[PDB]
Design an enzyme around this catalytic site. Structure first.
Site, short mmCIF file in Angstrom:
data_model
loop_
_atom_site.label_atom_id
_atom_site.label_comp_id
_atom_site.label_asym_id
_atom_site.label_seq_id
_atom_site.Cartn_x
_atom_site.Cartn_y
_atom_site.Cartn_z
N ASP A 44 0.84 -1.19 0.00
CA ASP A 44 0.00 0.00 0.00
C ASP A 44 0.88 1.24 0.00
OD1 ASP A 44 -2.13 -1.70 0.09
OD2 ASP A 44 -2.55 -1.40 2.22
N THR A 103 -4.03 6.07 -6.13
CA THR A 103 -3.04 6.93 -5.50
C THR A 103 -1.68 6.28 -5.53
OG1 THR A 103 -3.21 5.98 -3.30
CG2 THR A 103 -4.91 7.42 -4.00
N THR A 104 -1.61 5.03 -5.07
CA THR A 104 -0.41 4.22 -5.24
C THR A 104 0.00 4.19 -6.70
OG1 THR A 104 -1.05 2.90 -3.31
CG2 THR A 104 0.56 1.95 -4.79
N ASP A 154 -13.69 -0.66 -1.85
CA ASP A 154 -13.24 -0.66 -3.23
C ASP A 154 -14.41 -0.66 -4.19
OD1 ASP A 154 -10.74 -0.79 -2.18
OD2 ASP A 154 -10.41 -2.91 -2.67
#
Lengths: 509, 510, 102, 514
Positions: free
Chosen positions: A47, A80-81, A378
């Protein structure tokens, strides 16, 4: 003060070294990152976000990446990752060439000339998904929820996100805001189990309900939002001197009461039984609601009432002096306060406003509840993405090498200076193949070729590599899909940042 | 280790070498400390208070070591000196030389579990011939010469010179009156030394000696009930505060005036409680005295705990600070309560004596207490070897003379049994000559000289040495036939306890 | 502990009528008024001593100005013994608390 | 700074060897105990993998990482903790050898997964049912204690081991959460572990002649005060003002004296007969004249017990937590077929026994009263934790690494993936298997290989499980040897083995962060 070609190279270094380690953590196949602290704290994560927190940033570019990292995280919280992996490439590619080929400016405009060609390619590779077919959403969801690797009770409750989020899809703004997640308001149930966890309409109200404050079970009678503006008027519209001595207790607190009794009537006139009044309540406002034996629920929070304004989907009263059942307590409505496990849970349901539905979350413990909700998180984000753009796109390098050509084809076409930024930007697309070829542990350079070979005819339409299958694949044969929503967002996101840091050559104290 | 982590005290050098260091390192002074010796090993405290012990413990418990094994094995030496007596130095000195054998078996590279058993089966093989090496027993406690011999090897293997005289004293301490049938008082008979006179003037008294000064008119009767109190008269000064300090500053002064009436009524209550001896760990004062003179109770002016606790113990008493008139939960256990002047010093003498439950309190005398304290150490050797609780103790020859009996055999039995095993058995029986060597080198002659003679004399039980001229050349003293013997029990625990730790400590890599 | 409470009475002692002043202080503003409000329409008296003292404006004018000033003056005498008594009882608080706990 | 690429790996796997090393014999009859004056600084003595982990101060992160995942399996197993540490590093080297050869750790991790399942798949093939009988209970209890202590001390305890677990099968309880009530006796001798089918308390309190031998046991186990604080309290501790603390105590002894009279008829209601024994047990102190007059009633009474005891006695004796000394029902107050206050050493230990529930059952170890007494304690509890698995599963399998070779014989030969990319990890996977038998044997005796080929050939001959004889360092069939793993342990190990060895193999970096 930090300035100049350093910060220029620093705009490279930070976003680079950030993005560098993180692509290994990308993908359902992902290479985890260890942390240690002088404190001893150990962190094993794929993450980026969680990493993006405990890591330290001594460069504001490295700090502002966290900012733009939280941007996509504000937006979704996944990708974002992914976003950081894009610009970190870009500056590490175009700049040292093109800033020593001297410009902030060229690639900046070319970042847009990059941004559009994706969108261009996106209008091809992204192909519509319907929310009518659950699996057609849920296969993305099943792919999205297995990203965090719990398919167990998340998946069936992701139907609830496939429902609640889709069923709190509402509020056309005329360019149609309707596509959304947030209006879905999770339920927290001690006891029960994600099996019997299933939507009720509107918003199921857990938050302020530890116990019934609104009857027990109410079907026809209107759940009613009274919103501030229930405070007294001792005059006509005015307020005179208040209670002081004997007859002011009578006269004044009576002057207070009439105006509110006048406010009270309009509530009772629309036939409530339960009435949820947020802050700005009078005990005057309740006691005639008590005189009609219609419970007036006072001093309860706003979002909760907005949940309740989404629960029966009534509005919030903007003119509490002149009230309508169209205002609050719309439709027939429902109010049901149920003990499930420990806590009484107000269910304000039968929602008017286009449905509305919230995710009922019943874990045995709150853990077996929470594991679902996190992967549920999610879906409900991918649900809104399917709500946002319901065009499922082939995953992997399918979009990557596609836009790359189309950018280099745009390089061949435009043949300007920004052709080079394209070939610099089109180079950024290959991350996913490299990321996946890393995460599969294969040889990229053949698969780089082979994916260009996949684009040479197929145009990499559905064909990227998928490191998770380890091979260059159609993503229809793998059923790998994402909305054009999530793609362009993540795509555009770092492009902006690729502009952003490149803008910054200077830090001043 | 290899890593940031793993705080580890042993392994590699530490396991292999450094354990064996503190093994042999501590086994150094016990080489001088068991068997006939005078060896002067000068130990002072954190008080830096001069002393010399011939028993390992006062060296051992003195010491400080980060080696847990070396810090452990003393507990076996404890378990020796706990269960047993002189031969406590023997515990450590044996294993250390035996342990080097294992590391040289590790110089051979022999496996731990393989060397482990070689000492063990051989131990029970040593424990096999150990009763076979029982020669005599200790026939009669009632026989002074049985107990003197019992005390002889005891005191000898600490102090060889003072041996028999003391051995005749504490044998004629008549601790025989304790049948050793499962009752002997170890503490109730404990020595009370007299600084002054001689250590030949050192004798045994029967009934509890208390060297502390009698106060008050001596006990109204004898069998006098015994009030043992921490501070019955400390003065009337306050006992009363939780931290035993001042609350307000006016309390200490009232203790002068009513002191009389208190020290009247108090020791009056001591006359009223039936106690004709009240034992004051707090100060004797005249009014108490004056009234305990009117009430004719013997005050015991000041007390060590060793005074008090023993009186708390032997009398069944409870020592408590008193101001108010006290009472007896204590009474006496004692049927004769004396002031006697013994060592010429006024000595409180409590007496009650039974075949089980007697107090025979040995009164040592001497010019120096740094004499008697190590003498008591040398004396307690036999006080211990008294308590075996087999009256006939199955004596095997003391002084390590019956070692070579085992030593030859188990090591001949060594090759009998095979393999990496057989070496540790052979190594097992090679550690015998250490103590005689250690001793004979206290007399300054090597083992091989001595031991090849002990090998030449073969099966005796008789030959061993280590303080004498017969220690030097002949390798013949009778540590059997001259009156030096040792009980199976101690010699069992001598082998048994020296068996245990040596193997168990071998495991640790940390 | 008495040490906590010991000096607080001596404290509030000097505070007691000082408070009474501060109403008089307020009414000293009022008597300045009611002197200025009296042109002699009805008699003005400083009442001091069991004897009624026939009085005048200018006789009471400085006076009420002097009174108000003085009715501010018994403030400072407490302000003297204010931080005398509250401060030393502030040390005393720990003194016999632990000793009695001891 | 940071450690990336190979550096994020080496230091982790390099640390995983000397770690693995020292305790390579913590295990099996070849196992060797270790101490610590180092990690926690005290005088400490321990044998087990996970247990020696936590005692040390381990500043290397990985050393702390397995301690977690090992503790999971450590719970039920109690052995194999030391074991699972060994195969993982044995695995990590081969994977390292690949990356030394060069290769991708995730496709290598990908190479474990079929092999793990294939071995798991093999694990149900190799699991052979020896159902629960004292033999299987012996041979697993000893091989655990043969691991944890002397085979001597193993068979010494192997009696006490099976002792309690007979009544837990009376409970039909595959686990023991009681009968694990253990008493540690003050003695010179370690080896003495006394089965008491009831409990033991160190109490019988301060008074004798209470009929410390109680044949008809009627037990009041109470926290009521027959004795209590004399300490100065107002709010519960020393108050700023002195005096208000005083008014409390004068109601103490009076409350205690009254409850004495309450027990009189509490003896008379319950019994009325000293011939019917009554037992008080106080969680707090009891004044002498209480016990003294309670001795007058034909009652033994035990001051200051413990919560487990109260409950265990509430369980085992069918006893009570009941709070009162007032007249109470005898049927409430529990029963034991025999009760005695026993004395070894200074303290008088009540042996309460033949209790209504043979549920909380004392295994009473004597001992030197040391870390050694502490040492001999922890193992037998794990000796159970072995045999509970034997009670758990029906399948108990020959130990001493009998399963290991056959898997490497099973797995590698045909590629379990039929695919090299995974076979890479598989070839890495099936080497991890062999270390424990081949490291202990070669520690205990003849080598890995020349011993392997003997265990190999006989497996290669039969496929039957020939284990190691650790009494030598050579293979024998660990069926007859008695060293017997259950299926549970070996099941559990690959899970704890692989999943920790994987995610750490996939560390893409390590960073000091904040």
């Amino acid at each position: 003060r930090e300035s100049g070609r350093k910060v220029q190279s620093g705009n490279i270094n930070a976003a680079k070294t950030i993005a560098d380690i993180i692509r290994t953590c990308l993908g359902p196949k992902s290479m985890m990152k260890m942390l240690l602290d002088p404190m001893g704290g150990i962190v094993m994560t794929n993450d980026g976000n969680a990493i993006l927190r405990e890591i330290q940033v001594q460069h504001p570019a490295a700090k502002s990446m966290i900012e733009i990292s939280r941007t996509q995280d504000e937006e979704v919280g996944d990708g974002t990752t992914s976003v950081i992996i894009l610009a970190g490439e870009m500056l590490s590619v175009a700049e040292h060439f093109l800033e020593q080929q001297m410009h902030p400016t060229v690639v900046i405009s070319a970042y847009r000339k990059a941004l559009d060609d994706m969108i261009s390619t996106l209008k091809k590779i992204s192909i519509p998904v319907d929310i009518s077919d659950s699996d057609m959403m849920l296969n993305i969801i099943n792919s999205s929820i297995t990203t965090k690797a719990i398919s167990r009770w998340s998946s069936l409750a992701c139907n609830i996100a496939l429902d609640a989020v889709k069923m709190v899809q509402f509020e056309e703004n005329g360019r149609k805001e309707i596509d959304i997640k947030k209006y879905a308001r999770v339920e927290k149930i001690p006891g029960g189990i994600i099996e019997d966890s299933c939507v009720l309409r509107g918003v199921m109200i857990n938050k302020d309900v530890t116990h019934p404050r609104m009857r027990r079970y109410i079907k026809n009678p209107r759940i009613v939002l009274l919103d501030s503006s229930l405070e007294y008027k001792k005059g006509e519209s005015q307020t005179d001197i208040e209670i002081t001595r004997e007859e002011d207790f009578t006269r004044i607190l009576q002057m207070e009461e009439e105006y509110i009794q006048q406010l009270c009537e309009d509530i009772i006139q629309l036939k409530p039984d339960v009435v949820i009044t947020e802050k700005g309540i009078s005990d005057l406002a309740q006691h005639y609601l008590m005189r009609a034996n219609i419970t007036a629920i006072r001093r309860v929070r706003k979002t909760d009432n907005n949940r309740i304004a989404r629960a029966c989907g009534a509005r919030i009263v903007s003119r509490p002096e002149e009230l309508r059942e169209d205002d609050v307590g719309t439709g027939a409505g429902l109010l049901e306060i149920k003990k499930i496990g420990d806590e009484y849970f107000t269910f304000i349901t039968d929602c008017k406003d286009p449905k509305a539905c919230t995710i009922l979350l019943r874990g045995a413990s709150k853990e077996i509840l929470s594991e679902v909700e996190r992967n549920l998180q999610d879906a409900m984000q991918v649900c809104r993405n399917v709500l946002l753009d319901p065009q499922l796109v082939p995953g992997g390098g399918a979009s990557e090498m596609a836009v790359a050509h189309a950018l280099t084809e745009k390089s061949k076409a435009m043949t300007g200076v920004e052709q080079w930024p394209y070939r610099a930007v089109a180079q950024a697309l290959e991350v996913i193949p490299r990321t996946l070829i890393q995460n599969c542990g294969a040889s990229t350079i053949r698969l780089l070729t082979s994916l260009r070979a996949k684009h040479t005819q197929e145009n990499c339409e559905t064909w990227g590599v998928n490191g998770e299958t380890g091979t260059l694949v159609d993503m229809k044969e793998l059923g790998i899909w994402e909305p054009l929503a999530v793609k362009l967002q993540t795509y555009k996101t770092a492009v902006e940042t690729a502009v952003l840091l490149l803008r910054i050559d200077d830090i001043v104290s | 280790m290899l890593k940031e982590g793993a705080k580890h005290f042993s392994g590699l050098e530490e396991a292999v070498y450094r354990n064996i260091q503190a093994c042999k390192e501590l086994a150094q002074t016990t080489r001088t400390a068991y068997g006939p010796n005078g060896m002067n090993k000068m130990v002072i405290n954190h008080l830096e208070k001069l002393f010399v012990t011939n028993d390992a413990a006062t060296i051992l418990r003195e010491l400080e070591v980060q080696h847990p094994a070396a810090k452990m094995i003393v507990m076996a030496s404890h378990m020796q000196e706990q269960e047993v007596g002189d031969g406590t130095n023997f515990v450590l000195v044996f294993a250390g030389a035996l342990l080097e054998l294992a590391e040289e078996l590790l110089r051979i590279g022999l496996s731990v579990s393989e060397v482990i058993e070689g000492y063990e089966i051989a131990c029970r093989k040593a424990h096999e011939i150990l009763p076979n090496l029982v020669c005599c027993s200790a026939k009669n406690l009632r026989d002074i010469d049985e107990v003197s011999s019992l005390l002889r090897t005891s005191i000898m293997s600490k102090q060889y010179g003072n041996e028999v005289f003391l051995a005749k004293l504490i044998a004629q301490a008549c601790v025989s009156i304790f049948p050793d049938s499962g009752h002997f008082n170890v503490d109730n008979i404990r020595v009370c030394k007299i600084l002054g006179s001689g250590i030949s003037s050192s004798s045994v008294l029967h009934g509890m000696v208390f060297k502390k000064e009698t106060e008050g008119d001596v006990t109204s009767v004898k069998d006098a009930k015994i009030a043992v109190y921490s501070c019955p008269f400390d003065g009337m000064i306050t006992e009363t505060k939780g931290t035993v300090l001042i609350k307000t500053a006016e309390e200490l002064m009232n203790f002068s005036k009513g002191e009389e009436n208190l020290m009247d009524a108090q020791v009056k209550a001591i006359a009223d409680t039936g106690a004709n001896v009240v034992v004051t760990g707090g100060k004797v004062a005249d009014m108490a005295l004056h009234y305990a003179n009117k009430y004719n109770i013997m005050l015991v002016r000041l007390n060590s705990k060793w005074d008090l606790r023993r009186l708390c113990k032997t009398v069944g008493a409870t020592a408590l600070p008193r101001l108010t008139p006290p009472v007896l939960e204590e009474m006496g256990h004692c049927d004769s309560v004396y002031l006697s002047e013994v060592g010429d010093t006024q000595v409180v003498v409590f007496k009650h004596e039974k075949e089980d439950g007697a107090i025979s309190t040995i009164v040592l005398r001497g010019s120096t207490d740094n004499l008697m304290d190590d003498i008591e150490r040398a004396v307690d050797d036999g006080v211990n070897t008294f308590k075996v609780l087999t009256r006939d103790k199955r004596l095997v020859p003391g002084g390590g003379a019956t070692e070579i009996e085992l030593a030859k055999q188990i090591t001949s039995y060594g090759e009998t049994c095979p393999g990496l095993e057989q070496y540790a058995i052979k190594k097992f029986a090679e550690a015998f000559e250490a103590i005689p060597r250690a001793l004979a080198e206290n007399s300054g002659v090597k083992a091989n000289e001595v031991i090849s003679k002990l090998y030449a004399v073969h099966q005796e039980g008789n030959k061993n040495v280590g303080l004498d001229i017969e220690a030097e050349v002949p390798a013949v003293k009778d540590m059997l036939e001259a009156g030096i013997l040792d009980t199976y029990l101690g010699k069992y625990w001598a082998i048994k306890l020296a068996t245990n730790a040596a193997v168990t400590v071998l495991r640790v890599d940390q | 502990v008495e040490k906590y409470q010991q000096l607080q009475k001596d404290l509030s002692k000097s505070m007691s009528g000082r408070q009474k002043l501060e109403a008089q202080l307020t009414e000293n503003n009022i008597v300045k008024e009611e002197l200025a409000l009296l042109d002699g329409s009805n008699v003005v008296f400083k009442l001091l001593g069991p004897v009624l003292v026939k009085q005048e404006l200018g006789e009471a004018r400085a006076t009420v100005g002097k009174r108000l000033d003085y009715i501010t003056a018994e403030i400072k005498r407490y302000e003297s013994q204010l931080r005398d008594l509250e401060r030393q009882s502030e040390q005393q608080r720990e003194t016999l608390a632990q000793l009695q706990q001891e | 700074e940071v450690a990336r690429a190979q550096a994020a790996l080496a230091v982790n796997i390099s640390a995983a060897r000397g770690l693995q090393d020292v305790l390579r014999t913590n295990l099996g009859p070849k196992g060797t105990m270790k101490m610590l004056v180092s990690g926690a600084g005290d005088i400490k003595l321990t044998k087990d993998g996970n247990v020696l982990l936590h005692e040390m101060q381990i500043q290397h992160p990985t050393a702390s990482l397995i301690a977690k995942v090992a503790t999971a399996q450590d719970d039920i197993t109690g052995d194999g903790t030391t074991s699972n540490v060994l195969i993982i590093g044995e695995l990590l080297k081969q994977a390292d050898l690949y990356i030394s050869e060069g290769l991708h750790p995730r496709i290598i991790t990908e190479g474990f997964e079929a092999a793990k399942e294939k071995a798991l798949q093999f694990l149900e093939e190799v699991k052979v049912s020896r159902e629960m009988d004292r033999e299987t209970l012996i041979d697993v209890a000893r091989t655990s204690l043969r691991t944890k202590v002397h085979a001597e001390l193993a068979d010494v305890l192997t009696e006490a081991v099976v002792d309690s677990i007979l009544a837990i099968k009376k409970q039909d309880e595959p686990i023991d959460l009681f009968m694990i009530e253990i008493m540690e006796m003050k003695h010179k001798s370690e080896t003495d572990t006394s089965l008491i089918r009831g409990l033991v308390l160190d109490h019988g309190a301060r008074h004798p002649d209470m009929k410390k031998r109680v044949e008809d046991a009627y037990i009041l186990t109470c926290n009521v005060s027959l004795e209590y604080e004399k300490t100065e309290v107002n709010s519960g501790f020393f108050y700023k003002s002195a005096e208000e603390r005083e008014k409390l105590v004068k109601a103490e002894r009076k409350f205690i004296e009254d409850r004495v009279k309450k027990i009189i008829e509490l003896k008379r209601k319950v019994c009325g007969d000293s011939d019917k024994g009554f037992v008080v047990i106080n969680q707090k102190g009891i004044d002498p004249f209480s016990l003294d007059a309670l001795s007058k009633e034909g009652i033994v009474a035990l001051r200051r017990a413990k919560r487990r005891n109260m409950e265990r006695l509430t369980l085992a004796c069918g006893g009570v937590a009941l709070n009162s000394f007032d007249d109470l029902s005898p049927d409430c107050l529990g029963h034991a077929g025999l009760v005695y206050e026993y004395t070894l050493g200074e303290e008088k230990f009540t042996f309460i026994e033949k209790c209504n529930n043979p549920r909380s059952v004392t295994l009473l170890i004597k001992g030197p009263n040391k870390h050694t007494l502490t040492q001999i304690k922890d193992a037998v509890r794990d000796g159970l934790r072995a045999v509970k698995n034997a009670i758990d599963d029906g399948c108990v399998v020959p130990g001493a690494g009998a399963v290991e070779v056959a898997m490497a014989e099973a797995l590698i030969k045909h590629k379990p993936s039929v695919k090299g990319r995974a076979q890479l990890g598989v070839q890495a996977f099936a080497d991890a298997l062999l270390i424990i038998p081949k490291v202990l044997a070669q520690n205990s005796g003849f080598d890995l290989q020349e011993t392997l080929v003997k265990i190999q050939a006989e497996h290669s001959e039969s496929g039957q499980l020939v284990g190691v004889d650790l009494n030598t360092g050579e293979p024998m069939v660990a069926a007859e040897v008695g060293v017997w793993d259950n299926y549970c342990v070996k099941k559990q190990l690959l899970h704890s083995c692989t999943v920790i060895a994987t995610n750490i193999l996939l560390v893409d970096e390590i960073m000091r962060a904040g």
